[PDB]
């Protein structure tokens, strides 16, 4: 399952990088160039989403009350409720992942760093297993990269 593997890698790295503030230096697995550009896009676009919706993000985090492993495991049901049961576009996928990074940073702050990789798996499961058809039709991570590609300005 190349799409799942690639998705997990991109999401995991972003969540870890967001939580730790440090870049993972290991190479990507398969489809390295796309996965690298995908991660770079998420850095650009995801950070803005978290700031543009700061207050709503804080409010949802406070409402969820995430303390431990069992609370983190309960999030997949909420993700299916909010994300899966609605229209699909790249914007809503960025929000799924950006709120994930927001939860990841919270987990670091309460010393629950070990729950981050499970969280990343849960997000990936929801994204890939409920939206595979849409993702394939939109060209997967190549389509993601192409969608958010910004052309250089004329100097
Ligand atoms: C009102 O607060 C919202 C913020 C909305 C601003 C962004 N916006 C305009 C959206 O439309 C985001 C949205 O696509 C969405 O549908 N939001 S909404 O249902 O609440 N409503 C249409 C605004 C949208 C798309 C995808 C979302 C999602 C919202 N979640 C709820 C967001 C996090 C703060 C909640 C967050 C959520 C659901 C909550 C649990 C969770 C946990 C993880 Cl680890 C990752 C994601 C999520 C599902 O992912």
Curated annotation (Swiss-Prot):
Q: Where does it live in the cell?
A: Membrane; Cytoplasm; Mitochondrion; Nucleus, Nucleoplasm
Q: According to the UniProt record, what happens if one changes residue 63 to R?
A: No effect on ubiquitination
Instruction: Please indicate the residue ranges that the annotation assigns to the motif BH2.
Output: 133-148
Q: Where is this motif: BH1?
A: 81-101
What is the residue range of the signal peptide feature? none
* Assembly and binders: Interacts with HIF3A (via C-terminus domain). Interacts with BAD, BOK, BIK and BMF. Interacts with PMAIP1. Interacts with BBC3. Isoform 1 interacts with BAX, BAK1 and TPT1. Heterodimer of isoform 1 and isoform 2. Homodimers of isoform 1 or isoform 2 are not detected. Isoform 2 does not interact with pro-apoptotic BCL2-related proteins. Interacts with RTL10/BOP. Interacts with BCL2L11; may sequester BCL2L11 to prevent its pro-apoptotic activity. Interacts with GIMAP5 and HSPA8/HSC70; the interaction between HSPA8 and MCL1 is impaired in the absence of GIMAP5.
Function description: Involved in the regulation of apoptosis versus cell survival, and in the maintenance of viability but not of proliferation. Mediates its effects by interactions with a number of other regulators of apoptosis. Isoform 1 inhibits apoptosis. Isoform 2 promotes apoptosis.
Protein name per UniProt: Induced myeloid leukemia cell differentiation protein Mcl-1
Give the organism's phylogenetic lineage.
Eukaryota, Metazoa, Chordata, Craniata, Vertebrata
Gene field: MCL1
Q: Which residues of the full protein are shown?
A: 172 to 326 of 350
């Amino acid at each position: 399952d190349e799409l799942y593997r690639q998705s997990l890698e991109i999401i995991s790295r972003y969540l870890r990088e967001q939580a730790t503030g440090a870049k993972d230096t290991k190479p990507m697995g398969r489809s390295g160039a796309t996965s690298r550009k995908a991660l770079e896009t998420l850095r650009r676009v995801g950070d803005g989403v978290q700031r543009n919706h700061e207050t709503a993000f804080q409010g949802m985090l406070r409402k969820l009350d995430i303390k431990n492993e069992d609370d983190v495991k309960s999030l997949s049901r909420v993700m299916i409720h909010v994300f899966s049961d609605g229209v699909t576009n790249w914007g809503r996928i960025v929000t799924l992942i950006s709120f994930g990074a927001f939860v990841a940073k919270h987990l670091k702050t309460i010393n629950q760093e070990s729950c981050i990789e499970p969280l990343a798996e849960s997000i990936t499961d929801v994204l890939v297993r409920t939206k595979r058809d849409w993702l394939v039709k939109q060209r997967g991570w190549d389509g993601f990269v192409e969608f958010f590609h910004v052309e250089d300005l004329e100097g």
